[PDB]
């Protein structure tokens, strides 16, 4: 019964949705966790039901839920005040995924940059069956990503990805991209034709964002 | 005019909002002659309020910035609100009770966003005494103290802020000049009680052969309210005994029954 | 002589001015409308002299203005004259006397005077010059390519004379005086520290050049009132709000800023930094001379026994400020009024000193 | 006499306030504020003329507001408005671009061709845009002479009836009446001259652009150095402190 | 007075004059158009639930009333009427009369700048590097949009500014919105968190809603720390409301469905309390820092600041700049104006070296206890 994506916030999960969206000929159901968050004491549950019904009348359907945390968060037990909506909506949602009356007509895919705050009645195993890590990638994969974003732009013959890949220090996917991005704007400076190795090093040089210097006294 | 939507005529009365707020507060309308054991205060009060108003020319004629703010501190239930009400009553000044009720804000103030509006109404019915019962209250009076500290105009308005244990109130509310006359309430002894005792027992139908003193003697640690409870029970006791009158015995029981409660929670 | 020709010229101007078919046209303009019309609120707008309105009953009609008065005179989300037919915009309106400008807008005189604050000076010239000056004689800065002292801060113990200054200036000032307390800057409703600041600042910007004054800016931190929410992740924003409003973007204009805090150790540096608050002024606690002016000033306006010597009192307390001295002055008053005595005596001040100070 | 009069004469002629842009000064207090509102008046005689009338205003109090609105109303009820909205922006822009007419030069810079006549008018306009290398200023009184010039004043309503008469009838029977304004047309000008006084080195405080030699460009400068009679904005001739004399 | 005399009588002429033809000529701009458009119409706005086919009949919920499945105007095709479209509804007849556009509330439009803050790159001395990249995030892509295609890439679609309090970040916003051209949305996080639950989400949308219909617009967020930076979590659920608001901003700011030509400028003093989801690139790429001027910088700051006033031309701001190790460019300003007081405090036109020296020692030093530039350096 549906999956749950988690891991760094830059590895790459929204693409996976994007991937399914383009692939899964089924009626894609993308929804934000914040939206379900409403004012009128009865919008979150209603909307979920509304969304949980609309899907049940167009089988098949993959409902994507970005950041469950939006609507995903444990339920404390205080006195003085405390989130009722975000809770109930979860509850409502909970009562939808599983609970009275089952359904295998709808696929529910939720990513969260943080698989902790989520209450412990969303994971279980019935709600979302498969807990799925998105580990910040290695290098070759990095070498693999850079390439993807290096594809379009006009490069030349002198850009040892692996080097770049190696230089990369714990870079969630996008930061390669960012390097890739920056290196380009960098490369546009001297308006040179196609980028080069140096340009990328400088993307790294910046896509890192490690402040100034003056520490030129080391060694 | 209904469809013409022009004035057909002007009906009478409007109902007032400040009056409505006061009604909703319902703070006993107390006249002096009913509080024995609270003169020195009263005198002080008169000095800090009655005299200041009756003839502001007295303190103006002396060359002294008249006062605006007062403090009452002591046990809870000895007769503080009365001194604020009785004067205010005897003062013919609108006496306001601004606490923190959302009901009151919806009536008087259309929510606004602060407590400065409450002053607008007090102005309007000025001379008007502003009272306040027992952290949030402190600030509520603080803002008010600054509005009547050469910075507000008009005049003839005294916030009585009368709480307990002056050690509770903040410092900023004690900068020697800022609570004009600080008067303190004393616990109620045999006399004060005796007096208070005679005032409350006067309400009900009290038979002869009734020594009240003997009663306050048994009493030890009561206030302006406690005694009221005793009397009531005395009646309450007699009411259950199917007897209109109320001998001394009754009161002597209530003492315990109240001192039961006095010893209870 | 030409003065007469000048005067009558001024007079003839008055006549033509007062000297302001049409009656029908005016009635046409009356007839056009409806008696009676209908209030309703602005929403969107369009060059078609019509947009959608907003109503309590919430009919939202598309409607024209009856056009002599203007659409640009108004903003979206504003109550407008509507017929009862189509709710046709019949004209603009005047944002009735709100309950913000009032409270925040001290009209009557502030009392006191710049020759009532015994024992001050450099503190005085600093404030005045930085604020009162550029307001009255602002003609120098226009040549030294300087501007005015942005905001100013007053601090020190409790009774140094910070509120006097805010009171002194207002006494001989000429600009709208907005008296907003930070303590009031703390309400019991989420996202309400940023409305108050905007309304006070928005009200200040409207009334044109004015003095925004914030006494006890510290109370915005050094305090956590029960009825509140968020606890302190809310006050912070409210600070942030103040910090941003009292600061950047747009172009504040002539909103001068006066903050009255006792402890400057509990102010966010963002508020203290210059730009936001430049001149930082201290209020020392008299000594032996200032007090003399303070004592002489407070006992000089009353039947103070010419026998006693303000000195005894001055050299009395240890570090008594400009308040305590005033309390003693007043104490005698009540003493005076107590034993019924036009003029006070020694003990009267003594009892006062021991009645106020000590206690 | 312009508003008070016309205002009562119009409501009791579409070229009426066109002249008004004219004696300007008022082009800023009202012309710049109410000018556009005039222009907005649905009567094309206004929508024709105001864009023209803005010109001296535009070099005497031009604005950026309507400057964009002309773009909006370009095709609104009319393509001649567009034909103006291109041309007019050239006009007001051709001697009063950027600074006060920043929103003006932009458009025309984004005006090229949807039409060979637009292109014609744009070439006109962008010519006008860069007329005088894009730096010119229309002011009845060149520099800071402190005296009204009836020479150019005559050069204007001349241009009003010329482009106003042929405008009310057909496109343009001609196009040789373009330059009638030149009788006063001045650059963006600070004329900064020396103590002998035929062109020679001499300088001022900073402009934008530098210390201005004899007749070097800027507009409305209040500088360090002194003129001779009544130091002012604009044309100022330069003598220097005997100790520091230069 | 003679000139003044001529002044009065001249004015009196028109005054006398104006009254004349006034008598003579004694509504239609509008009273026509009013009465013209009086026989016109009103139309209650409507919110379309959706249309249906094999024919039209559009299905709709108005507002204060309810749903009516009702016909549509003849003048509007069966297409130019997509769902979720506030349309106008022949009041009585109750039939689509005309279409319209979308709501944005009166909180998103109230912050669209209208005017523009005079702050050219002349006042932005000591930042040849800061503005240099900024211009890339904001300037170049919005104006010259050729190159980035000639080579096919993408620009830092959003950019981050941080630094202690007083580096000039708000000028760069003001600087940009000045020589920019695009639509500069000034939205402060102070704006973002309000009262009732799930209310900020509407703001970001509107923001991104209004950002959208207008290609090439600068959204700027100063004090983002207010909106939401950290994602705590515990048995209190405190900074929760704001967090989502951030997630909302997060989500719509770079997560599923592109965003568009909404470039992004964030200003902080504490770039340390900020959610990785903000920071990451895509959402926040170019990361720019605003140093506390060194040597050559402050000289530009001094010269820039004092360049606009009557100062002594002998005295060299360089010396002063030297005595200013790590003071932001703001304080340096209290000096330049500070001398103003001193210079005015005597009676003088021009200030001296000491006038500045004192100011330096008067501002800097004296106002050192405060500074807060050393506590905000480590982003506390
Ligand atoms: N394996 C990958 N290959 C290419 N791009 C990736 C990969 N993983 C992540 N990304 C980048 O990350 C971005 C999406 O980030 P995402 O992980 O969806 O954020 P979040 O996880 O917070 O939703 C995309 O622009 C994509 O370029
Ligand atoms: N001195 C007094 N004499 C008689 N009754 C008193 C006295 N003080 C208090 N009371 C009784 O207390 C009641 C009001 O209590 P109050 O004093 O207002 O509460 P608090 O102790 O909080 O001020 C009155 O009904 C009154 O009967
Ligand atoms: N030297 C003084 N001269 C005049 N008034 C004084 C002096 N010292 C104290 N006061 C009076 O005492 C009050 C103290 O207020 P303020 O100086 O604002 O203290 P705080 O800042 O702690 O509130 C003022 O209202 C002022 O009238
Ligand atoms: N390098 C500089 N050049 C010009 N002005 C500066 C410079 N650094 C700081 N300033 C001035 O100091 C102020 C700092 O503003 P800003 O850094 O936006 O405040 P905050 O840190 O609260 O956002 C600006 O108003 C600006 O005029």
Swiss-Prot record, chain A:
Disulfide topology: none
GO molecular function: ATP binding; ATP hydrolysis activity; identical protein binding; proteasome-activating activity
Post-translational note: Sumoylated by UBE2I in response to MEKK1-mediated stimuli.
Modified residues (Phosphoserine): 156
Residues annotated as binding ATP: 7-14
GO cellular component: cytosol; extracellular region; ficolin-1-rich granule lumen; membrane; nucleoplasm; nucleus; P-body; proteasome accessory complex
GO terms under biological process: blastocyst development; modulation by host of viral transcription; positive regulation of proteasomal protein catabolic process; positive regulation of transcription by RNA polymerase II; proteasome-mediated ubiquitin-dependent protein catabolic process
Location in the cell: Cytoplasm; Nucleus
Principal cellular location given in the protein's record: cytoplasm
Keyword RNA-binding on entry: no
UniProt keyword Nucleus present: yes
UniProt entry keywords in alphabetical sequence: Acetylation, ATP-binding, Cataract, Cytoplasm, Deafness, Host-virus interaction, Intellectual disability, Neuropathy, Nucleotide-binding, Nucleus, Phosphoprotein, Proteasome, Ubl conjugation
Described purpose of this protein according to its UniProt entry: Component of the 26S proteasome, a multiprotein complex involved in the ATP-dependent degradation of ubiquitinated proteins. This complex plays a key role in the maintenance of protein homeostasis by removing misfolded or damaged proteins, which could impair cellular functions, and by removing proteins whose functions are no longer required. Therefore, the proteasome participates in numerous cellular processes, including cell cycle progression, apoptosis, or DNA damage repair.
UniProtKB/Swiss-Prot annotation, chain B:
Residue sites binding ATP per the record: 74-81
Subcellular location: Cytoplasm; Nucleus
GO biological process: negative regulation of DNA-templated transcription; negative regulation of programmed cell death; positive regulation of DNA-templated transcription; positive regulation of inclusion body assembly; positive regulation of proteasomal protein catabolic process; proteasome-mediated ubiquitin-dependent protein catabolic process; regulation of transcription by RNA polymerase II
Keywords: Acetylation, ATP-binding, Cytoplasm, Nucleotide-binding, Nucleus, Phosphoprotein, Proteasome
Primary residence: cytoplasm
Region (May mediate interaction with PRPF9): 70-265
Highest taxon in the source lineage: Eukaryota
Role summary: Component of the 26S proteasome, a multiprotein complex involved in the ATP-dependent degradation of ubiquitinated proteins. This complex plays a key role in the maintenance of protein homeostasis by removing misfolded or damaged proteins, which could impair cellular functions, and by removing proteins whose functions are no longer required. Therefore, the proteasome participates in numerous cellular processes, including cell cycle progression, apoptosis, or DNA damage repair.
Name of the protein this chain belongs to: 26S proteasome regulatory subunit 8
Curated annotation (Swiss-Prot), chain C:
Residue(s) of cross-link: Glycyl lysine isopeptide (Lys-Gly) (interchain with G-Cter in ubiquitin): 167
Region of interest (Disordered), ranges: 20-34
Residue stretches of biased makeup (Basic and acidic residues): 21-33
Alphabetic keyword roster: Acetylation, ATP-binding, Cytoplasm, Deafness, Intellectual disability, Isopeptide bond, Lipoprotein, Membrane, Myristate, Nucleotide-binding, Nucleus, Phosphoprotein, Proteasome, Ubl conjugation
N6-acetyllysine: residues bearing it: 188
Summary of the function given for this chain in its UniProt record: Component of the 26S proteasome, a multiprotein complex involved in the ATP-dependent degradation of ubiquitinated proteins. This complex plays a key role in the maintenance of protein homeostasis by removing misfolded or damaged proteins, which could impair cellular functions, and by removing proteins whose functions are no longer required. Therefore, the proteasome participates in numerous cellular processes, including cell cycle progression, apoptosis, or DNA damage repair.
Listed name of the protein: 26S proteasome regulatory subunit 4
Organism listed in the record: Homo sapiens
Entire protein: shown range: 65 to 429 of 440
From Swiss-Prot, chain D:
Membrane-traversing stretches: none
Family: Belongs to the proteasome subunit S2 family.
Span covered, complete protein: 607 to 908 of 908
Quaternary structure, from the entry: Component of the 19S proteasome regulatory particle complex. The 26S proteasome consists of a 20S core particle (CP) and two 19S regulatory subunits (RP). The regulatory particle is made of a lid composed of 9 subunits, a base containing 6 ATPases and few additional components including PSMD2. Interacts with RPGRIP1L. Interacts with CRY1 in a KDM8-dependent manner.
Primary gene name: PSMD2
PC repeats: 52-83, 102-117
Name of the protein this chain belongs to: 26S proteasome non-ATPase regulatory subunit 2
Record's function text: Component of the 26S proteasome, a multiprotein complex involved in the ATP-dependent degradation of ubiquitinated proteins. This complex plays a key role in the maintenance of protein homeostasis by removing misfolded or damaged proteins, which could impair cellular functions, and by removing proteins whose functions are no longer required. Therefore, the proteasome participates in numerous cellular processes, including cell cycle progression, apoptosis, or DNA damage repair.
Tissue: Found in skeletal muscle, liver, heart, brain, kidney, pancreas, lung and placenta.
Region (Required for interaction with UBLCP1): 68-241
Species for this entry: Homo sapiens (Human)
């Amino acid at each position: 019964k549906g999956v749950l994506m988690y891991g760094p916030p830059g590895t790459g999960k929204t693409l996976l949705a994007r991937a399914c969206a383009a692939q899964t000929k089924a009626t894609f159901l993308k929804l934000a966790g914040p939206q379900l968050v409403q004012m009128f004491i009865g919008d979150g549950a209603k909307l979920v039901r509304d969304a949980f019904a609309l899907a049940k009348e167009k089988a098949p359907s993959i409902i994507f839920i970005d950041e469950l945390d939006a609507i995903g968060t444990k339920r404390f037990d205080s006195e003085k005040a405390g989130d009722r909506e975000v809770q109930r909506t979860m509850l409502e949602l909970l009562n939808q995924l599983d609970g009275f009356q089952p359904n295998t007509q709808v696929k529910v895919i939720a990513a969260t940059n943080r698989v902790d705050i989520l209450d412990p009645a969303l994971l279980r195993s019935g709600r979302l069956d498969r807990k799925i890590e998105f580990p910040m990638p290695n290098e070759e994969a990095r070498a693999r990503i850079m390439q993807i974003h290096s594809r379009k732009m006009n490069v030349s013959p002198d850009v040892n990805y692996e080097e770049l890949a190696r230089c990369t220090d714990d870079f969630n996917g996008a930061q390669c991209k960012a390097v890739c991005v920056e290196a380009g704007m960098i490369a546009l400076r001297r308006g040179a034709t196609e980028l080069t190795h140096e340009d990328y090093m400088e993307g790294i040089l910046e896509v890192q964002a490690k402040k100034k210097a003056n520490l030129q006294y080391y060694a | 005019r209904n469809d013409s939507y022009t004035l057909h005529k002007i009906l009478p009365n409007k109902v007032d909002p400040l009056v409505s707020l006061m009604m909703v507060e319902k703070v006993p309308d107390s006249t002096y002659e009913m509080i024995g054991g609270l003169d020195k205060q009263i005198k002080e009060i008169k000095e800090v309020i009655e005299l200041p108003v009756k003839h502001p020319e007295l303190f103006e004629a002396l060359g002294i910035a008249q006062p605006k703010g007062v403090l009452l501190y002591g046990p809870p239930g000895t007769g503080k609100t009365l001194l604020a009400r009785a004067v205010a009553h005897h003062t013919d000044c609108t006496f306001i009770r601004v606490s923190g009720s959302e009901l009151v804000q919806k009536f008087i103030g259309e929510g606004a966003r602060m407590v400065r509006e409450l002053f607008v109404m007090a102005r309007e019915h000025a001379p008007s005494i502003i009272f306040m019962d027992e952290s949030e209250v402190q600030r509520t009076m603080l803002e008010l103290l600054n509005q009547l500290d050469g910075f507000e105009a008009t005049k003839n308005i005294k916030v009585i802020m009368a709480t307990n244990r002056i050690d509770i109130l903040d410092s900023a509310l004690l900068r020697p000049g800022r609570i004009d006359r600080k008067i303190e309430f004393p616990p109620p002894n045999e006399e004060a009680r005796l007096d208070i005792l005679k005032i409350h027992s006067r309400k009900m139908n009290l038979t002869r052969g009734i020594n009240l003193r003997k009663i306050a003697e048994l009493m030890p640690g009561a206030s302006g309210a406690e005694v009221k409870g005793v009397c009531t029970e005395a009646g309450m006791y007699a009411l259950r005994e199917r007897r209109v009158h109320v001998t001394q015995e009754d009161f002597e029981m209530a003492v315990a029954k109240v001192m039961q409660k006095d010893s209870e929670k | 002589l030409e003065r007469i020709k000048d005067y009558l010229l001024m007079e003839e101007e008055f006549i033509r001015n007062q000297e302001q078919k049409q009656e029908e046209e005016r009635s046409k303009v009356d007839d056009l409308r409806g008696t009676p019309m209908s209030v309703g609120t602005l929403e969107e707008i369009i060059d078609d002299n019509h947009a959608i309105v907003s109503t309590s009953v919430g009919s939202e009609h598309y409607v024209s203005i009856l056009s002599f008065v203007d659409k640009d005179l108004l903003e979206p989300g504003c109550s407008v004259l509507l017929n009862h037919k189509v709710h046709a915009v019949i004209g603009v309106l005047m944002d009735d006397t709100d309950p913000l400008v009032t409270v925040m807008k001290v009209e009557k005189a502030p009392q006191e005077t710049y020759a009532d604050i015994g024992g001050l000076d450099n503190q005085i010239q600093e404030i005045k010059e930085s604020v009162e000056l550029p307001l009255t004689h602002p003609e120098y800065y226009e040549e030294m390519g300087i501007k005015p002292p942005k905001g100013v801060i007053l601090y020190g113990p409790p009774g140094t004379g910070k509120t006097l200054l805010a009171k002194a200036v207002a006494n001989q000032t000429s600009a709208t005086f907005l008296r907003v307390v930070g303590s009031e800057l703390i309400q019991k409703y989420l996202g309400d520290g940023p409305k108050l600041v905007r309304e006070l600042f928005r009200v200040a910007e409207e009334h044109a050049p004015s003095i925004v004054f914030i006494d006890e800016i510290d109370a915005i931190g050094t305090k956590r009132y029960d009825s509140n929410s968020g606890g302190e992740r809310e006050i912070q924003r409210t600070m942030l709000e103040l910090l941003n409003q009292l600061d950047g973007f747009d172009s504040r204009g002539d909103v001068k800023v006066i903050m009255a805090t006792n402890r400057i150790e509990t102010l966010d540096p963002a508020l203290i930094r210059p730009g936001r608050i430049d001149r930082k002024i201290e209020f020392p606690l008299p000594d032996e001379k200032t007090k003399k002016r303070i004592f002489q000033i407070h006992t000089s306006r009353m039947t103070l026994a010419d026998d006693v010597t303000l000195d005894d009192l001055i050299m009395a307390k240890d570090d008594l400020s400009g308040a305590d001295i005033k309390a003693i002055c007043t104490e005698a008053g009540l003493m005076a009024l107590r034993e019924r005595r036009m003029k006070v005596t020694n003990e009267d001040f003594k009892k006062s000193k021991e009645n106020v100070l000590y206690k | 006499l312009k508003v008070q009069q016309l205002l009562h004469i119009c409501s009791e002629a579409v070229l009426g306030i066109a002249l008004i842009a004219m004696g300007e000064e008022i082009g800023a207090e009202m012309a710049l504020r109410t000018f556009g509102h005039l222009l907005r008046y649905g009567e094309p005689t206004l929508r024709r003329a105001v864009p023209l009338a803005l010109a001296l205003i535009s070099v005497s109090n031009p604005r950026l507001n309507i400057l964009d609105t002309l773009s909006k109303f370009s095709h609104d009820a009319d393509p001649e408005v567009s034909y103006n909205s291109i041309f007019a922006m050239g006009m007001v822009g051709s001697g009063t671009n950027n600074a006060r007419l920043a929103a003006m030069l932009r458009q025309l810079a984004q005006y090229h061709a949807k039409d060979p006549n637009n292109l014609f008018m744009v070439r006109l306009a962008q010519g006008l845009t860069h007329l005088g290398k894009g730096t010119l200023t229309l002011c009845p009184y060149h520099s800071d002479r402190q005296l009204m010039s009836q020479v150019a004043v005559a050069g204007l309503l001349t241009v009003l009836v010329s482009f106003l008469d042929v405008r009310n009838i057909i496109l343009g029977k001609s196009h040789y009446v373009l330059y009638g304004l030149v009788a006063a047309m001045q650059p963006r000008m600070l004329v900064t001259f020396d103590e002998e006084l035929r062109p020679l080195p001499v300088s001022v405080r900073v402009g934008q652009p530098v210390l201005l030699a004899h007749g070097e460009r800027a507009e409305l400068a209040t500088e360090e150095f002194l003129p001779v009679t009544p130091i002012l904005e604009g044309f100022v001739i330069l003598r220097k402190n005997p100790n520091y004399d230069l | 007075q003679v000139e003044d005399d001529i002044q009065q009588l001249l004015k009196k002429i028109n005054e006398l004059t104006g009254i004349k033809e006034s008598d003579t000529g004694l509504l239609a701009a509008d009273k026509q158009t009013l009465q013209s458009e009086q026989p016109l119409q009103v139309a209650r706005c409507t919110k379309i639930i959706n249309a249906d086919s094999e024919d039209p009949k559009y299905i709709i919920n108005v507002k204060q009333f309810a749903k009516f499945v009702v016909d549509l105007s003849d003048q509007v095709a069966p297409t130019d009427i997509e769902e979720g479209m506030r349309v106008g509804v022949d009041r009585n007849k109750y039939q689509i009369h005309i279409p319209l556009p979308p709501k944005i509330d009166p909180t998103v439009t109230m912050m669209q700048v209208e005017e523009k803050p005079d702050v050219t790159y002349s006042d932005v001395g000591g930042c040849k590097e800061q503005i240099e990249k900024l211009r890339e995030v904001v300037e170049t892509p919005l104006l010259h949009p050729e190159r980035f295609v000639n080579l096919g890439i993408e620009p830092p679609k959003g950019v981050l500014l941080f630094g202690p309090p007083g580096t000039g970040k708000t000028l760069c916003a003001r600087a940009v919105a000045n020589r920019t051209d695009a639509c500069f949305i000034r939205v402060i996080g102070s704006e973002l968190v309000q009262k009732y639950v799930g209310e900020g989400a509407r703001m970001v949308r509107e923001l991104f809603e209004m950002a959208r219909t207008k290609k090439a617009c600068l959204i700027f967020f100063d004090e983002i720390d207010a909106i939401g930076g950290a994602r705590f979590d515990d048995g209190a659920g405190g900074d929760n409301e704001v967090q989502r608001t951030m997630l909302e901003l997060i989500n719509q700011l770079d997560g599923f469905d592109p965003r568009g030509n909404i470039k992004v400028l964030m200003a902080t003093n504490r770039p340390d309390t900020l959610d990785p989801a903000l920071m990451r690139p895509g959402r926040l790429d170019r990361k720019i820092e605003f140093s506390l001027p060194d040597l050559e910088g402050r000289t530009h700051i001094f010269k820039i600041h004092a360049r606009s006033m009557s100062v002594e031309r002998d005295i060299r701001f360089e010396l002063l700049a030297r005595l200013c190790p790590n003071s932001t460019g703001a304080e340096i300003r209290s000096v330049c104006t500070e001398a103003g007081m001193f210079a005015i405090r005597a009676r003088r036109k021009i200030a001296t070296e000491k006038d500045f020296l004192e100011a330096v020692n008067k501002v800097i030093k004296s106002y050192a206890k405060f500074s807060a530039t050393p506590r905000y350096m480590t982003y506390n």
